[PDB]
Structures are given as C-alpha cells and as structure tokens.
Structure 1
Amino acid sequence: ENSNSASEGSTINYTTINYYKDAYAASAGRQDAPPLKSPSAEACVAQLTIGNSTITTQEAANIVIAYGEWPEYCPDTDATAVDKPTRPDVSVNRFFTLDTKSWAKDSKGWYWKFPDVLTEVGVFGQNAQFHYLYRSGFCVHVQCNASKFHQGALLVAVLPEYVLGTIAGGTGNENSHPPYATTQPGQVGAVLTHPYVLDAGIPLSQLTVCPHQWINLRTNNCATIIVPYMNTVPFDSALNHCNFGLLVIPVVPLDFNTGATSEIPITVTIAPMCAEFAGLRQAVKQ
C-alpha cells in the first residue's frame, strides 16, 4: 500500500478498511491550560524586554499564549525553500509602537493586519521588502489607561486569516469587494463599519473562540497576546498575505461623568518574534 492518506503523518491512529493500493482510497474508519481557552503564560511590576525595548505589565498569568504555542523559527522538517535564511534578531525582534487611537463613547472598533502593520517600519520593514519569504510570531500589547471612575471593556483578539467582506451594496445584489486600503490599512489600522459581524458575516460574540484578552477598565489597563506563526506554508510573502488580524472592539462602551478626562487613548505596541527572511532580491513595496 502507498502511504498517501491525508491523515498520514498525524499523531492519531485510525482503523480503516481498504481494497486498493493507495491509502487515501480507504474508509474514514474510527480513532483507535487548553489551547483554545487562551492559555496564560503561567498555565503553559513585570517587565518584558526584547531587543532594545521594554514594556511593563504585571503578571505572567495575564499574558495569553495563542493556541498554547510559543513562536519558533521554522524547523528543518517543515522548511521547503533551500537558501539559508537571514535571522537579524535584535534589529527586528523588538517593540514597535503604532499611531494611537482615540476611544470615544460611540467608537465602533478597530483592526490591524499582520505583518502589514510593520512592512514600512524599521529594519523589520526593510527585510520584509527585500525578501520574497518572511515568517515570524508576534508579541501584541494593547494599552489603555483610564481612572477608577471610568468604565468600559475592550475585547482584544487575534483572528488568523481575517478575510473582510462588504455589505454587498446594502441590498446584497452587488458583488463588491473590500479595496486595498481596507484589507491592508497599514500601521494606522482601520475602523469596523459593522463590528457585530466583524465586517465579515461572522459573530463578534464568538470571537472569544480566538486568542484574546479583555481590557476591563476597572481591573486592567493592558492586554498582551503572544502569537505563533500560523499558515499552510512554512514561509510566505509579508506583502501579499496577512497571517492574522488584531481586533480591538469596545463590547461595553466607554463611559464616565462630565469633567473626568475624556481623552482616553488606545495604543498598540507589537514585537516580531523569531522573524526570519529568505529569497533575497531588490526591495519590493507591494
């Protein structure tokens, strides 16, 4: 028998029936913190230092490790491109802070795409443009300060392969598509027009099935999520493909009494982790 079944190479063993020389012709048969509940760093004044930069959190049980997996360089068993990759390390795996957003009582919510956010920032950006192939994980840190008299709750989540959709002309008759500035808004991010369906026909209420953390003003002022590289290929174009989107949505609206500070910003600070590149040539912006 040829070992060409789709399940060949998995830890689970199935008992199947077959009458042909190819394994995939066989019957499906029968088989014979949790990765999905946003595992905290512990389950798997504080200071996270990476490169020449340091942010300050409070607890390791407050850092989510997406899918329970820490970022890593691509192993030889999964690699396919044969050139030696460049792993610049400290010049690219460090914290970059993007433009700050302003949280208002009627804000809808925002999203950023990765690695799009940094393709034009620092040495990371340069490497992303000079190489065809890119790969990395990310430490995502969202910051929001308010007083003990303010209230509100942001859901901060990482949605892998965040494909956006349109309102189809309102009536649903128009097969319109999101424009480039909407699918890859860059460093400044973009605003959601229908946060309830994440501008993609899926419920915000179930977004917690993805790696996430809440920023509930009365309890915390920051959220930190560590994201491993996720894709169906070991390396990919940092320009053509965004591996995941970061969503920051006010599920419980911001509120405070008149006279309390009304300028409440939200700041995103991100650090590539284990960034590596391959397929060197001239710089390409898109």
Structure 2
Amino acid sequence: SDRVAQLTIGNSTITTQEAANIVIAYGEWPEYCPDTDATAVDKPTRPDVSVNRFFTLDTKSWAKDSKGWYWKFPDVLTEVGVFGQNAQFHYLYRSGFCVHVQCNASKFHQGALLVAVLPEYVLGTIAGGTGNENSHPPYATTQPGQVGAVLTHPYVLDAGIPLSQLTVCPHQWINLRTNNCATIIVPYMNTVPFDSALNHCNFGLLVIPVVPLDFNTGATSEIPITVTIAPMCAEFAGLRQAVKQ
C-alpha cells in the first residue's frame, strides 16, 4: 500500500509491485508558467497528451564493476516523438518531469543504486591529469543524448564534488533486497521562466552503484537498468522553423 503503485499519464501506464514511495523534488509539483512570472508575450502551445507521456530510453547493463551513468534533461528527449519535434520547432521550452528508473534482480542478488537529480549538472575535466591543462568536455559529454554517458570518477561526480553528499538532492535508492525502482517528480527549476531545450540542460539524472552488484555464479548475470521519463506540463513558445542545435 506504499510498495505497490501505478503511474498513468498520456497513453502510457507504469506498474510496480516493489516501490519505496515517490519523491516530489523540493516538495513542489510541476506547473505551467503563471502570468506573473512569464515575460514572453506569445500564446504558448501546450500539446498535453502527445508530449506529457512516458518515454523509455535505451537500457544499460549493470556489472560488478560499473562506475555509473548520467543523462541530461531535456537533452534525452530532444529527438524523440512529438516532444522532440516541439522542442526543435520552438525557441522556448519549459516542463517538469516524472523520472522512473527500473532495475529488478532476485532475492539472492545484492547491490544498491543511488538515483538522484542534480540541477545544473555542469561537468569538469581531469585537467590533463597534472592540472595544467584547461581542457573542457566535448558536446558529446555534456549532452550525451538519449544514450546517456558513463562517469569516469563517480566519487567526485566528474565535477570536483563529493558523491557522499549527493543525497542533499532529490533522490531514492534502489536497494535490490528492498525495491526495484525509483520515482522522482521534478518541477521546472531555472532563473528564467522558459528556456532553450537545446542550449541549456536544467538538470541531470545520476544512477550510481554505491554498493556494488554481487551474486553467486549460476544466478542470472544480465541485470539491466531502464530509464523511463515523462515530461509534465510541457509548454512551448517562440515558434519558427525546426532547429536541431
């Protein structure tokens, strides 16, 4: 009655029989931009069900030695379905998200993933190792698309900050002996009411195995992790021709 759940939005429904509640980031539900805060004068388009629905991205495989992955929003969907199309045809975009990360194993496996949302996830480089080289991450690393990317130094989140403190951000854990999914509802966060879905990623989703996967040999070894996300209250403005970047 807290372990079972159903998420239905648009023409999509998710079920889970081993949940651990649902997190509402910073205690706020997503909402369309109100007239007091807005600044752009054109009437926006709010497609509703064609874009506020669940999209499932490519699946990753969890190994006894995985470092961890991350995805950027709204990058992941800029080229998927009607949402992506709207993001390309408009200068301005704004929305919230429902993030549902899935991973099930058996009562004989063990491990724990930390699933977190980090607003304005700016990445850094290892500075040529010595620290004398002012290198920067390439587009493919800052905006990995729907495939996401791999962390090279999870301990410092590839950004000089401690993973140990990431729990200060909206999160849940997928502890195999307890649950098989994490759900986080994220409201729009930015210093401006609307923004470009192409140039600015509002937040990043990190999935890091803090307690490594383990199991006796003979047990299923392919333990995937799947990410399903749904935009909420997607709004768009500043219509023109389509732009990919």
TM over 0.5: yes
The match for 1:237 is 196
TM-aligned CA deviation for residue 89 of structure 1: 0.3
Q: Secondary structure at the match of 1:124?
A: helix
SS in 2 for 1:62: coil
Shift of 1:58: 4.7
Give 5+ residue unaligned stretches, structure 2.
none
Deviation of residue 46 (structure 1)? 1.9
Render the CA deviation track for 1:132-191: whole Å, top value 9, x for unaligned: 000000000000010000000000000000000000000000000000000000000000
Q: 1:60, 1:194 → 2: CA distance? A: 29
Task: Quote the Cα distance in structure 2 between the aligned partners of 1:163 and 1:46.
Answer: 33
SS in 1 for 2:8: strand
SS at match of 1:231: coil
What's the CA shift for 1:60? Answer: 8.4
Q: Give the structure, 1 or 2, with the largest relative contact order (CA under 8 Å, sep 6 or more).
A: 2
Q: C-alpha displacement at 1:200, in angstroms? A: 0.1
Q: Following TM superposition, by how much is the alpha carbon of 1:57 offset from its aligned partner in structure 2, in angstroms?
A: 3.0
CA drift at 1:47: 1.0
Determine the C-alpha separation between the residues in 2 that align with 1:282 and 1:170.
Answer: 43
1:261-285 deviation line (CA, Å, top 9, x unaligned): 0000000000000000000000000
Secondary structure of 1:61's aligned partner: coil
Contact persistence 2:172–2:183 (CA under 8 A):
yes
Q: How does 1:89-128 map to 2 (within 5 A)?
A: 89-128=48-87
* Alpha-carbon contact 2:19-2:180 (below 8 Å) kept: no
CA contact (8 A) 2:19 2:179 kept: no
Alignment-derived partner of residue 110 in structure 2: 151
Cα 1:61–1:104 shift into 2, 3 Å: closer
- Aligned partner of 1:273 in structure 2 is 232
Question: Runs in 1 of length 4+ with deviation above 2 angstroms?
Answer: 57-61
Cα pair 2:93 2:196 within 8 Å, conserved: yes
In the alignment, the residues of structure 2 paired with residue 263 and residue 229 of structure 1 have an alpha-carbon distance, to the nearest angstrom, of 35
Q: d(CA) in 2 for partners of 1:63 and 1:234?
A: 26
Between the aligned partners of 1:50 and 1:121, the Cα distance in structure 2 is: 17
Whole-Å separation in 1 of the counterparts to 2:127 and 2:19: 44
Is 1:188 the equivalent of 2:147? yes
Alignment of 1:131-210 (within 5 A): 131-210=90-169
Q: In the aligned structure 1, how far is the partner of 2:20 from the partner of 2:181?
A: 13
User: TM-score, normalising length from structure 2?
Assistant: 0.97
1:61 to partner: Cα distance: 6.4
**Using a 3 Å threshold, how does the CA distance of structure 1 residues 260 and 58 change in structure 2: closer, same or farther?**
closer
Q: Distance in 2 between matches of 1:95 and 1:59?
A: 19
| Alpha-carbon distance between aligned partners in 1 of 2:175 and 2:75, rounded to the nearest angstrom | 28
Query: 1:199: how far off?
Result: 0.0
How far apart, CA to CA, are the structure 2 residues paired with 1:222 and 1:46? 11
- Counterpart Cα distance in 1 of 2:231 and 2:61: 25
Q: 1:198-230 CA distances to partner (integer Å, 9 max, x unpaired)?
A: 000000000000000000000000000000000
Look up the SS of the partner of 1:106 in the other structure. Answer: coil
Q: Deviations over 1:20-67 (max 9, x none)?
A: xxxxxxxxxxxxxxxxxxxxxxxxx42110000000135886100000
SS in 2 for 1:94: coil
Secondary structure of the 2:20 match is helix
Other-structure match for 1:54:
13
Segments of 5+ residues of structure 1 without an aligned counterpart are 1-44
Tell me the secondary structure at the aligned position of residue 235 of structure 2: strand
Report what 2:23 is aligned to: 64
